[PDB]
Amino acid sequence: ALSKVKLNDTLNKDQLLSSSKYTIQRSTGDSIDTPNYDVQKHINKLCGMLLITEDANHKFTGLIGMLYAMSRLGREDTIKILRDAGYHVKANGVDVTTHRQDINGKEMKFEVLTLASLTTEIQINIEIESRKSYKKMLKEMGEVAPEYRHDSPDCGMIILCIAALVITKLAAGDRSGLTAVIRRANNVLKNEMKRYKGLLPKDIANSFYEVFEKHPHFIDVFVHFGIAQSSTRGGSRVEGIFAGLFMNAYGAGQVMLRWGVLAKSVKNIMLGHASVQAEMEQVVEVYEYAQKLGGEAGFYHILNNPKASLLSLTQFPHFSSVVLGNAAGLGIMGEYRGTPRNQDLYDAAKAYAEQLKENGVINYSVLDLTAEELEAIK
Amino acid sequence: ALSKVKLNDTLNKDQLLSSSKYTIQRSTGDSIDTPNYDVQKHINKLCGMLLITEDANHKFTGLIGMLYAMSRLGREDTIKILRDAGYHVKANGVDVTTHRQDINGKEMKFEVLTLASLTTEIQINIEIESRKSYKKMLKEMGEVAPEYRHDSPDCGMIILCIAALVITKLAAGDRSGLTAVIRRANNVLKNEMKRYKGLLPKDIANSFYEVFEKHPHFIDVFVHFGIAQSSTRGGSRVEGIFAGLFMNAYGAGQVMLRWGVLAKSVKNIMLGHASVQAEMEQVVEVYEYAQKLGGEAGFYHILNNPKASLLSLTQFPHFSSVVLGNAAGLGIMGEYRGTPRNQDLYDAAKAYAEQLKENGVINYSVLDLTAEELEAIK
Amino acid sequence: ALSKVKLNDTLNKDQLLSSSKYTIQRSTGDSIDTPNYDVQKHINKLCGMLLITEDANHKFTGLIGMLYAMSRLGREDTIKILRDAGYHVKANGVDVTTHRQDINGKEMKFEVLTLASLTTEIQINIEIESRKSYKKMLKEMGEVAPEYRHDSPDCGMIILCIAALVITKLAAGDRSGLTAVIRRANNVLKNEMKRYKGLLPKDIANSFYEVFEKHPHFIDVFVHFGIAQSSTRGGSRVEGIFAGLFMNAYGAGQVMLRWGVLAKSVKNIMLGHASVQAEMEQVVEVYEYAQKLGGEAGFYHILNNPKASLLSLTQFPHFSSVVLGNAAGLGIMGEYRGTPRNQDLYDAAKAYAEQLKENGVINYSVLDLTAEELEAIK
Amino acid sequence: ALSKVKLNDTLNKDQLLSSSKYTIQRSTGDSIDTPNYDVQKHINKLCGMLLITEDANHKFTGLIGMLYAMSRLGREDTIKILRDAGYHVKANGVDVTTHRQDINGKEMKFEVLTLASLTTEIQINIEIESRKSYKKMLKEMGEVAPEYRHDSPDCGMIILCIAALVITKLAAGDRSGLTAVIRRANNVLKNEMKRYKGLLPKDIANSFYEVFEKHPHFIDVFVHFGIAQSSTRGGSRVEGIFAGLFMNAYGAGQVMLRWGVLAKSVKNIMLGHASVQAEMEQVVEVYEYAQKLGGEAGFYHILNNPKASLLSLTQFPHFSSVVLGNAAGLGIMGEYRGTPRNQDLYDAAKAYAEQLKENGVINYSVLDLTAEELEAIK
Amino acid sequence: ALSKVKLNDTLNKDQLLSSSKYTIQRSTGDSIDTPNYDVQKHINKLCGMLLITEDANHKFTGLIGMLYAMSRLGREDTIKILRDAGYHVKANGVDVTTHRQDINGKEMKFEVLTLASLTTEIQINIEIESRKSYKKMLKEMGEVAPEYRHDSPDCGMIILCIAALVITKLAAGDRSGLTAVIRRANNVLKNEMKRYKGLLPKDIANSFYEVFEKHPHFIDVFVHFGIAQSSTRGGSRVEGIFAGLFMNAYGAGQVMLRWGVLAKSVKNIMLGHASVQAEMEQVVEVYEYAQKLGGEAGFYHILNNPKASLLSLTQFPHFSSVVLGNAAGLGIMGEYRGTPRNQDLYDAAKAYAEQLKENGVINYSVLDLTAEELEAIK
RNA sequence: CCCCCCC
RNA sequence: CCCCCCC
RNA sequence: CCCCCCC
RNA sequence: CCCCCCC
RNA sequence: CCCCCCC
C-alpha cells in the first residue's frame, strides 16, 4: 500500500558505484620511487638527519616522510596500494649507492639513495648542514647524547606524527587547519620538541600540505599505512603517539553524524518535531549505511572517496539544523563554520540545549540505591 | 477469482524491451578518436592551456573534454562502451607528432596531437594564445606559481565539472538550463574561477551543449565515465568536486518519484483519497520496478534511455496531482514548469501541505525518555 | 465432480496455433530493397532533403522511412525478420553510385542510390527541390545554420516518429486516425516543425498509411525495428521521442484489458454481480494467458497477429459491458465507438462510477496517523 | 476402497479406434493440382479477376480459392497433408504457360495456368470478363484506383474468408447454413463488398459448398491451411480477418461442451440432481479427454475424424438435458434445433435459468469491499 | 504389513487361460467365400438391387452383406482375421463372371458371381426382381433420381448399418432384441426407408441373426470389420451412421460394470455396508483387470472370448445386488431381466436411489459462493 | 470476426 | 510522448 | 556538491 | 447414432 | 455358470 512507496536512494547509489564494470586508471606521471624494507634504515637516518639540523629548509620533508611510510609499507605493498587506487605506476626500485663529492677542497664519502624526485646534491647538502649542526652542538653542550642524536628509530614516526596532524586537518581541504596543526604540534611532541631542536611545525606542516596537494595518491598511500600501523600489536611510545594521533582522523568531516547521535543521547526535545520526523526515515537510512560501511566509514573524507557524500546529513536541512543547534547549545560547536539551513529549528534547539545543561536533576533510576540516604543526609 | 484479474504493464514492457532478439546499430559518421592512456598527460596540458588563456575562445573545449574522458576510460574501454551502446565506429588511434610552422617570420616547433575531429592548426592557435596570455600574466605579476600555470593535474576535471553541470541540466533538453549551470558554476569552484582567468561557465557550457547535441554517443561515453570515475577509492579535490557534481544527476528527470516518497514521509492527507488509492497499485509497481533496477535507474533520463518512460508518474494523474500539490505546499518546487493534471487534488493537497509547514507539534513519543519531568517542562 | 468440467479454451487455441507443423509462405512481389549499415548515412540524408524542401511531394516518403528502418536494422537482420515472418523476398542489395542528369543545359553530378522500388530520377528531383529550398532559405535569412539543413542526424527519426504515431493509430483499420495523428504530430515535434519547413504531418501520415496498406510486410519490419530501437542503452532526444511515441502502441486494440484492471481497482460494485461472476472464471483465464504471453502481447493488434482475438473481452458481454460502463463513468472513454452488449449493466455501472468520481472520503486507514488531531483543528 | 472402482471408457474407445493396426487407404480419383509457392501470384491475380468482374461466373471460384490455399501451403506440404489424411493423390505439378487465343477476330496473348481441373478456355473467359468489367468501370467512373483492381495482394484472402464462413457453418453439413453465411458475409467485409463489385456471398458460398462436397480432401487441406495461416506472426488486415473468422470454427459441432462449462459457471442448481450426479463421472471423463486432446479437439467435427463421437454429451441424456435447458433458459441458443432427451429436467433447468437472468444480488464479499465505510454506504 | 496378503485371483485366472499349453483347434467345415477388392463393386450393386425391390426376399441378404464386408476388408486381411481368430478355412476366391440365361424367350446378359453358398440362379432372380421393381416404380412416378437407384455406393452400408444394430443387440443371443433392432432402425435410417422401399429391418435383422448363428465366424469377421470401418477418416453419411451405430456395440454384455461406476457416482449408501466392504477388494481387482485390458475389454462378450467371464460382477452377489438395485432405483434399468442375488441389499439400495431422485445435492465449493441465502432459497 | 478513446 | 525545481 | 570545531 | 445457435 | 435395458 503506502509502505512499499520507498526509493532507497543512498543504498542504490552505493550499488551503482560499487558495481560499475568499467574501471578507469589515472596517470600519475613518469614513476614513483618505491623503496623496499632494506632502505628503511637509511630513510630513518635521513629523517633523523632532517630533525637534527637547525632551521633547515624543510620544504622537501613531506616527500621524505612519504618515502618512509611507503618503505615500511613495502615494494609489493605500495604497488598493490597504487593498483587498488587506480593508477599507472612503474615500480622505480630504490637502492643504496655511495657518491664521493669534493666540497670546499675536501672530498669525502657520503651515501646516496636513488630517487627520481630527490637528487644526490640535496642529500649531500642536508648532510653538510647536519654536520654543521652536529659540530655546533658538540661545541655548545660538549657531548651529544644517544637520545639527542639522529640515530633514534623514532624520527620517521615523529615526522609522520606531524603528518598525521596535517592529514587530520586536511578534511576541510582549503589550507585553513595550519594554525590548528601548529597548536597540536606544540602541545603534542613536547619532549621531541625539546630534544630534537630541528622540529619546525610550520615547515613540516607546509611541506606535507604541498606534497599532499600536488600528489593525491600519496594521501591514499599514507591512509592505508596509518590503518596498517594502527593494527599492529605493539610499538614504541612514539609509534603509540602516532597511532593515537591518526585515529583522530577517523570520522574527519563526518562530525554531523556524531553530533546527531549525541543529540539522540542528550535527548533534545525537538527531535520529535514534525519536520524532523519527516526526514527521520532517510536519517536512519544514512546511519544504517554508515554502520554497514563499518571500518573505513571514517576515512571517506580524508581521501576524497566519492562515496563520501553518501554520508552527509546536510541534505536534510531540518534534521541538520536541529542537530547543529543542539550541538551549539551544549557548547560543543566551536567556530564551526557550518550554517543551519532551517533557522527556526536551529534557534529553538539551541535555546533548549542552553537550558538543559544548567538544569538536571539526580536521576534516581541511574542511582542504584533503594533507600534515599541523601534524604537521610538532608 | 477477482484477485487474479491483473495486468502487469511496466514489467511486461521491460520484458519485451530488454529481451529483443534483433539489434540495430546506428552509424555515427566517419570515426571517433579513442585515445589511450598515453595521451592523457598531453590532454591535461591542453586543458591547462585552455584555462590559462585569457578570455579564451572555448568553443572547441567540449571536444577536448570528451577526449579527456575517453582517455581516462582507455582505448579498449571506450571501444567497449560504444560497442555496447550500439554504434559503428573504428578504433582511431591517437598519437603525438611535432609540427614546425614558421609564423610571423620566426619558426617555432610545437607538440601536436593527431586527431580526426580536431585539427592541428586550431591546436597551434590554442598554444600560441596560451603563450600570449602567459607572457601577459608574467608581465602583470612577475612570477607564475605552479598553481597559476597549465601544468596542473586537474584542468581536465575542471572542464568535466562544468560538463557535469551541463549533464545535470540537460534534463530540460532545450538549452533552458544554461542560467542554472552558470549560477552553479559560479557558486561551485570559486577558487578555480578566481585562479584561471579563462574559466568562462557560459562558453564552456555552450560548447558542451553543442558537443552533446551533435554527437549523441558522447553523452553515453560521458555518463559511463562518470559512473566509473565516482567509484575509485581515491581522488584529488577536483575529482572530488566532479564526483559531487555528477551525483547530482542521479535522479535527473525523476524528481517526481522522490517527491512521492516525500509525500509518504510527511504523511500527506490526500494520499488516502479514494481516487488516489485507485492508482496506489500501479504506483507501488513503479516504485518496485525502480528498486529492482536499482543502480542505473537514475541515469535513464540523462541518457535518453528508452526504458526511461517506465519510471514516469505522469501516467497517474491523481497521484501525480496530489504529489505535485504536496511539493507546492511545502514550497520545495521553485518553478518546476510541469503542471498538475487534477486541479482539485492539487489545490486541496497544496492547502493541507501549507497547513503542515506552519503547524507542527513536538511529538514527545519520538523521544524515548522515561523521565516524567517532561510534563513539568510542558 | 464439477471442478474438472473446465474446458481450457484459450490455452488450447494457443497450443493449436503455436504447435502446427505446417508453415505457409507468402510472396511479396518483385523484391524488397534491404540496405546494409553502410547506406544509413545517405538514407538519413535523403530524409533530410525531404524535410528541408518547401511543401515537398511527400507521397514518396513512406517508402523512404521504411528503407531507413531496414538500413538501421541491417541486411541480415531484416532478411532474418522476413524469413521468420514467412515471406519470400530476395535480398536486393543497395549501394551508392553516381548518376548524372543534364537539366537546364548544365550537366550535374548527383549522388544516387540504386534501388528497385526507387528510381534514379526520383532521387534527382528530390535533390533539385532541396537545392531550390536551400537557395530560397539562403536568400531570405542570409545564412543557413547546420540545424537548418538536411545533414542533421534527426531527420530520419522525425519521419519515423510520424510513422510511430500512424502505427499507434492504425489499430482502427479504417484510416480514421489521421486527425489524431495530425494533432499528436503538432503537439509533439513542435521544435522540428518550427525548424524544418517541410514537415507536413498530413502528407507524411497519408504516405505512411499507403505504404503500410499496400505492403503488409513493412508493418512487421517496422514493429520489430521499433522494439529493437527502444532497447538501445542511449541515443539522441529525437530517438527518445521515437521510443516514447512507439511505446504508446504497446496496448493498441487492447484497451478493454486495461479498463478491466481499472474497474477492479476502483472496486466497481457490479463486478460482484451474478451475471459477471459467471464470466469471471474465463476472464481470469484470459488475463493469465495475457500474462503468460508477457512481452509481445501488446503488439498483436498492430501486427495483425492471428493470436490477437484470444485477448478480446468482447466474448464476455457481461464483463465487457460492466467494464465499459465503469470506464464511461470515470470519463476515461472519450469517443470510444464501442457499444456495450448489456445495456442494463453498462448504465448501472456507469451510474455507480459517477457516484465514485465526485464523492470520495479521505481514508485515514491508509495513512498511519496515530492521532487524528486535525479534526479538532478543523 | 472404491476410489479405484472406475472403468475409464472414453479412453478405452479412444485407443480402440486409434490403435487398430488396420489403416485402410481409399482410392480418391485422378489427382489434385498442388502448385508450389511460385503460382501464388497468378492465383491471387485470378481471384482478383473473379472479384472485379461484374456479376462474375463464380461457379468455378471455389476451386480457385482452394488452389490458392494449396499454393500458400506449398507442393511438398500439401502432399504431406494429403498423405497424413490418407489419400491416393499424385502431385500434379502446376506451371505457367502462354496460350494465344483468337477471339472476336483478334488474337491476344494471355497468361494461362496449366491445370487439369481448370482448363485454358474458361480461364480466358474469366480474363475477358475482367477486361469488360474494367473497361466498364473506367468508362463509368473515370479512373479506378489500384485498390479497386485485381492486383491487390488480398483478393484470394477475401475468397478464402467466405470459405471460412462456409466451413464454420458446415457443421450441419447440408447447406443449411447459407442464410448465416450470407448474413455474416454482409456484416463482415462491408468495405470489400463496397469496392470489389463481383463479391456475391451467395455465389461464392454455394461454390465452396459444392467444392467441399465434391472433393472431401479439400476440407482437410483447408482446415490445415487455416491452422497454418493462424500461426504467422503478422500480416495484412484481410489475413487477420480470415484468421479471426477461422477461429470461429474451432468448436464446431461441440457447442454442448462449452454450454456445459457455462452451466457449471452460472451455478445452475440441477447440476446437483440425482440423475445428473449419476453420470457426472462419465461427463468429467469426457471433459478430461477433451483437455488431454487439447489443440485439435475442436476440429474433429469439421473433419470426419473417426473419434468425433467420443466428445458428445448427447449420450448422457440427463446432463445433456440440463445443459441444453440452461442454454435455452439464458437465451444463448437462438434457434439451436437440438432437442433435449429428458424433458422434465430440461424444463426445470430452463425455468431456474430464467429465474437467474432477472434476479441476481450483488456479492459484496467477492468484491473486495473490506472497508466497512464503503460497505455501509452501499 | 497386511497389505502383503492379497491373492489376486482374476489376474491369475487370466494368466492361466492365456498361458495354457494345450490349445485344441477347430475345423470350420468346407470353406467360406472371401472376395477381394474387385468384387466390392458388384456386391454393392447387388445390395442396391435388394434395396430398390419392394418387399424383396431378404432370406439371403445377410450373407450378401457379410460378403460385402469381406470384399471391403480384402482377401489377405479377411484371411488374417480368420487365422488370428483360430479358424481352419481355405480362401475360396470369388470372381466376376458372366452368365447368359435365356428367360421367357429372351436371352439377357448378366454378370454373375461364383459363390459356394450363393448360387447363380438365386442372384439372377434377385437381378430380375430388381428390374421388375424398377419397372413398377418408374411407371408409378415417372422419373427416378440418381440417389434413388442401385448404383448408390452406400446400399451395402445401409445393410451393414442394420447389421451394426444386430451386433449391438446380439448380447442376449436368443433373438430377443429384434424389437429393439426394429425401433432403432426406424428412428435411425428414416430417410433410407423413405427412399429404398426394400428396407424391412424385421427381415434383414432376422437374416443377420441367421447368418451370425449359422456361421459363428462371421461375427468375428464383422466385429473386426466394424472396428476397421470406424477408423477410416473419410466417409459419406451412411458410413458415418455405420461408425456411430457400431461404437454402440462397444461394451456389450458388460452393463454391470458401467452401472457399478454409476452407483459409485451417486454415492449410494449401501456401498458402505459391511458385506459390500468385504468384497470391495475383489471388485477393484475386476475393475483394474478391465482397465488393463482396455481396448478389447468391450468386445469380449460379442465375440465368444474365453476370458470374458472374468469381467462379471455377478460373482459378487452383494456388490452386484447393490449396483443393480441402485440402477433400477434411478430408473435407468429398463426391461433388464437379470434378477438380483441378494434381495435385501437390492431393495434397500433401490429405495435409497429413488429417495435421491427427489432431492438436490449442493456442489458450490468449487467456485466462490457465500451460500447462506444462495442455499435453500434456490 | 477483432478493432475503435486520450496520451 | 517523457522531461522541467534548488542543490 | 560535500567539507569546516576540539583532543 | 452424431451434428444443428449467435458471433 | 455368464449374458439380458436405452441410445
Side-chain angles (χ1 to χ4, degrees), chain C residues 62-73:
Chain C
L63 302 103
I64 300 176
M66 281 324 317
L67 295 169
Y68 185 42
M70 301 156 267
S71 65
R72 176 149 303 175
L73 292 173

Side-chain angles (χ1 to χ4, degrees), chain B residues 169 171 183 253 314 333 336:
Chain B
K169 294 294 181 182
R183 291 191 306 105
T314 307
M333 281 166 87
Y336 192 83

Side-chain angles (χ1 to χ4, degrees), chain A residues 92-156:
Chain A
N92 213 2
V94 172
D95 273 350
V96 175
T97 56
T98 289
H99 176 88
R100 299 177 185 90
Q101 184 176 1
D102 166 42
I103 301 138
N104 306 128
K106 297 166 185 165
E107 196 202 274
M108 73 291 291
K109 294 187 286 185
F110 294 122
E111 183 270 326
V112 175
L113 202 66
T114 61
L115 281 294
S117 51
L118 205 65
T119 61
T120 293
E121 67 274 15
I122 301 301
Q123 296 170 3
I124 308 308
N125 295 116
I126 295 190
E127 185 79 33
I128 67 169
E129 287 85 5
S130 86
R131 295 288 88 193
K132 286 170 192 81
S133 292
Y134 182 76
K135 69 168 68 68
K136 275 72 176 175
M137 295 298 102
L138 273 194
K139 170 191 219 169
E140 298 171 36
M141 65 182 179
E143 186 190 59
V144 296
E147 294 85 5
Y148 275 89
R149 68 187 321 195
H150 62 87
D151 282 358
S152 178
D154 294 305
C155 304

